[PDB]
């Protein structure tokens, strides 16, 4: 039904001098992303510092991005947490501010079973008419959403997609095979963009598209074109740059990276800190290595 | 200055058939635990389903338990989350309902650095006059609080202890050595209580204590008296019982195990689920092997 | 300078009824592989039971295979162990019996350092005129050959290729980037053939080519042309088959598979065991699932 | 029936300037060990550089050591490899030269199943009248000997003990419970000596005993006596010294340390290397921190 395209951007949440949401800055970023290869936007996810956002802040931010986007591009809210009843609640608030879909992380910290996760997600999906996108992220939640559990959930009418940040393209290939062709499997690891599309992934849910969305769209087109040498050169830029962006807890690297190219998005909330000088210089070098 | 004894219990939060906090049963539980080896109570932590509790529910639970306990035993509130300012607010609210200390978990899901975790814990600790216990749990949070971070934090007057669910008694031994005598180190793995205390741990923060607390206090005392053959046999029982309480996601096994011995404290909130019949049968068998 | 093709095959070693090498069944196997997509043969390596072959056997086997191959395809001898001195000696015997390259595994069991491995591999390389293929297999040896370490070794004149079974195509990409264009990087994991070649890998050192060589050859031709539909359809057969060959320790599965499809190559030597009648049935129905 | 005592030492193999076995230094070392707390000797194991020994060197070293010890202490020869037939042969030769027992490591590199390891160890044990000590070392063989497998093997009459380097004192506790009283369980991890004996282990198969075997014997006595705070100071020294001994690949550090305390045993064979000047300086300072 819906189509998030090939690059959904996991959008930072810009903050002012005091650490409150900066809604004018949110408006420059949303416009820039759309002008630079972003085909769908994920609002208030991990990369949006969802942990330190309040539910009132999350809803303000969803409402504001819905307005500024203006149907140019689907808007996905990160309404999912480790509390099912809380997730049903924030899901309904995002629906009522007119977001286009919801992203639902695998619950973190409380280590649910596969059956437990199945009911979590079945219940939040039952709570909305909207399209749902699953988010598998063992590297933050510990648990995997097993291939079998995903295949079961795809069977549900408004569960349409999965961001798979498992780092394993063999697991993805199994999910593509065993799910219907209208179930869209997305990589959630930038550097695996090319190999995952190689095996059938529709695209990437990205963090590096904040700074190299055009190049990414280029890479994808060149690989779909059978121009492998072209794609591989761009693939390697993506990998280099992605690595510079996770040398410290994300999203401080990518917020700092955006500043270094004249788009200030403020700093970060504790427990995250700003880059050290050392860290700044290192990222700086990599941002300079980007061709123009 | 503050002493939590040998067995601090990570107390479940009893629920009714409709998943609401059952305060009468909480009273029954508090008094049972104190009559059966519990030397300190942790309220509203992981085992108490902190993830599915509202801020308002947590503070009401803290208050009830401060009131029931009536100073017989110290009361420790799990106020720390992956969000620092919110961890500060919850901590004030708990200070105000009369708790004796707070426990602060290593931030889950957002994956902070050691310097970020250092500033996290420092800030919460500087916000309260209460004693502070750390909580290392890489098996739920992914990150470890490093030994050196733990040591730096130990130097803060009101950071007086740590629960190390890290699974590694050599790391514990390094913390013990490098910290002053007045920093208390607890195991957070029931199965390791015996070997942890051999290397100089003060005791355990326990889940198995809900059902075999009397056998645990007895195990500790035999060890302390050099009755090694006795301690080994009880340790063997503790390891067998503890394993049976974590075949499904905690705290569900232990809430079932309490119902089996007469204290029915309800079920669990989503994304967690009741034991299956097959799962109950297995657990039953193990409880039926605890000596009378 | 030497060209191993898109599909090198890590050849099983046929044993007779008393467990000795079956030289006639070896002849038959070699001729089959070359007829079914294999572009280079790897003799007496992990998959050909190197741990249970005597050094005499290894050399008798290298000789015969060279004879039967008759220069149709490169022959690569598996002459590296975790003993540098013995690896030089067998590399020498191998050379005298006229193989075309040697393959050298990361030392297993003794856990050498990056610098130790560097000296291991540099010393074996310098002992011989032949081309050398490195073999990274942290899943059997535990240590990895680090990108920097592979790069330094690539600068050595006869070190021409790597087989990388580290399972990580992002490590692969980095070896490709930082090495000269004349350093061939092969996947050592069947299922990663397509994503690997996507990022610039030259091909695969395969086990599954024993039973689906032609299909893999077709998948690679499809992919190199830009026909991603048929590539992905065959990639999915590859992954399924590969998986069925690794449910019991290798090479017991693929030897058994060879017998099911019409080329019996005997059993294995201890500590390896025959598949259970039940493991047989399971594998047999994956084999019957291959389109004929 | 046979008693290896509290501290079996995993003995290094002294090499001369050319890398050949040094029998004069072997003799010096056996006598030093025996006067400094070693209650049994493991010859030609991992720590003795078995990978880079020839079969003939191994048996030569078994012989020399046997005749030097002159029945003063049991001699355990490390005849087990990842090849069952080879292991039967080496075991038959060790037996003819008069060792008291054999150690048998879980096969490395070829990744055998629990039932393959069962048949591998059974066949080898059946081949000799000598006592047999199992060796679990997943940090070098990747596979684990499962608790059930160990229990089956302990029913064999000449399979009388296990060195468990699995890092896990709870798997050790289970083995102890499930096997009979006459199956002895040692730690294979020095740092874990104290807490392993707490849970019922007979003692330690050790590397630190080459330099602080007197202190270990002191610590063990203190624990058995109930002088727990005295055992804990020695434990801290154990763990700290042990860690300096595994910063580079063992046994280069313990051979370095031996020279520092006046017992030169030469260097190591490739693929292992001498400590750097750096690594030496750092190890030295830990050796200086031992009380003399």
């Amino acid at each position: 039904m819906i189509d998030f395209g090939t690059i959904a951007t996991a959008m930072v949440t810009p903050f002012d001098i005091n650490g409150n949401i900066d809604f004018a800055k949110t408006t420059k970023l949303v416009n820039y992303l759309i002008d630079n290869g972003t085909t769908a936007i994920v609002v208030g996810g991990t990369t949006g510092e969802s942990p330190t956002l309040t539910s009132e802040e999350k809803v303000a931010l969803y409402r504001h991005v819905v307005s500024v986007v203006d149907k140019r591009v689907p808007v996905i809210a990160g309404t999912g947490s480790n509390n099912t009843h809380a997730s049903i609640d924030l899901t309904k608030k995002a629906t009522e501010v007119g977001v286009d879909a919801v992203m639902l992380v695998a619950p973190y910290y409380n280590k649910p079973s596969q059956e437990g996760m199945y009911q979590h997600f079945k219940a939040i999906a039952e709570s909305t008419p909207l399209p749902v996108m699953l988010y598998n992220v063992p590297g933050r939640s510990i648990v995997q959403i097993s291939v079998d559990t995903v295949v079961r959930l795809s069977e549900i009418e408004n569960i349409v997609a999965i961001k798979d940040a498992g780092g394993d393209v063999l697991t993805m290939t199994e999910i593509i095979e065993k799910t219907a062709d209208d179930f869209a499997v997305y990589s959630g690891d930038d550097g695996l963009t090319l190999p995952a599309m190689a095996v059938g992934a529709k695209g990437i849910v990205s963090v590096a598209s904040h700074v190299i969305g055009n190049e990414m769209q280029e890479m994808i087109a060149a690989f779909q074109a059978g121009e492998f040498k072209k794609a591989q050169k761009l693939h390697q830029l993506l990998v280099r740059v992605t690595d510079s962006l996770f040398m410290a807890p994300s999203p401080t690297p990518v917020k700092t990276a955006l500043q270094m190219v004249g788009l200030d998005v403020g700093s970060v909330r504790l427990p995250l800190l700003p880059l050290t000088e050392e860290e700044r210089v290192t990222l700086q070098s990599v941002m300079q290595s980007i061709p123009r």
Side-chain angles (χ1 to χ4, degrees), chain A:
Chain A
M1 39 187 97
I2 191 161
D3 183 13
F4 308 123
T6 54
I7 299 181
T9 294
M11 200 188 47
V12 296
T13 298
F15 299 135
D16 64 39
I17 191 74
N18 298 134
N20 298 108
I21 300 184
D22 183 337
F23 288 91
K25 227 75 168 289
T26 303
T27 286
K28 287 191 43 48
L29 212 226
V30 166
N31 280 327
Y32 167 90
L33 293 182
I34 301 194
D35 190 31
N36 286 254
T38 304
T39 66
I41 304 181
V42 195
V43 195
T46 330
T47 309
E49 300 175 69
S50 67
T52 54
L53 260 32
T54 67
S55 198
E56 294 61 51
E57 281 166 326
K58 288 167 174 172
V59 175
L61 186 65
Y62 304 153
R63 172 189 291 118
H64 181 247
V65 173
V66 160
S67 88
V68 178
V69 162
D70 203 24
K71 303 310 210 183
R72 288 183 279 168
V73 113
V75 181
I76 319 170
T79 67
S81 67
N82 65 173
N83 179 336
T84 311
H85 171 106
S87 296
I88 273 163
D89 187 80
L90 175 65
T91 287
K92 295 175 172 268
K93 296 181 161 125
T95 312
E96 253 291 29
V97 295
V99 305
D100 299 294
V102 288
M103 177 115 92
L104 301 185
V105 77
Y108 41 91
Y109 186 56
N110 58 0
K111 288 197 290 144
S113 64
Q114 297 297 321
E115 186 57 38
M117 271 180 287
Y118 178 73
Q119 300 294 155
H120 171 77
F121 286 132
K122 171 181 207 302
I124 300 155
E126 235 80 297
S127 106
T128 184
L130 269 47
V132 164
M133 167 149 103
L134 269 21
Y135 176 25
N136 179 52
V137 61
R140 319 180 88 109
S141 298
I142 306 181
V143 295
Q144 308 263 349
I145 316 177
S146 75
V147 169
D148 289 348
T149 295
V150 184
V151 169
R152 290 175 74 200
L153 288 168
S154 66
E155 217 112 300
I156 290 167
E157 215 182 60
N158 59 327
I159 304 180
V160 302
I162 177 164
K163 177 185 172 178
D164 192 348
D168 177 350
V169 307
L170 303 190
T171 223
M172 294 191 216
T173 115
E174 199 184 350
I175 294 173
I176 289 145
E177 194 178 31
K178 307 244 265 265
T179 64
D181 311 341
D182 64 343
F183 195 80
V185 183
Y186 277 83
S187 182
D189 298 286
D190 278 300
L192 295 189
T193 306
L194 184 64
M197 289 191 82
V199 300
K202 191 162 180 194
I204 179 53
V205 194
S206 180
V207 169
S209 51
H210 289 260
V211 292
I212 53 167
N214 292 330
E215 293 85 336
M216 291 181 60
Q217 286 298 9
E218 209 166 322
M219 186 188 72
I220 301 185
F223 166 89
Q224 251 149 356
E227 204 334 44
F228 297 123
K229 264 116 298 284
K230 224 207 137 202
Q232 283 155 17
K233 228 258 201 84
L234 291 158
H235 169 71
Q236 253 130 225
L237 179 68
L238 215 208
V239 170
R240 275 146 36 39
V241 166
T242 294
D243 291 356
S244 73
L245 263 24
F246 293 88
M247 280 323 308
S250 194
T252 314
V254 77
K255 277 199 177 187
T256 304
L258 279 169
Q259 199 286 341
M260 295 181 162
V261 303
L263 213 146
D264 203 298
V265 295
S267 192
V268 301
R269 292 168 183 194
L270 287 161
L272 308 195
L273 299 169
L275 271 38
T276 64
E277 174 61 14
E278 177 268 284
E279 289 170 337
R280 274 196 76 94
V281 166
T282 303
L283 180 75
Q284 178 78 96
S285 307
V286 189
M287 296 306 295
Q288 277 161 211
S289 87
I290 302 163
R292 335 272 172 168

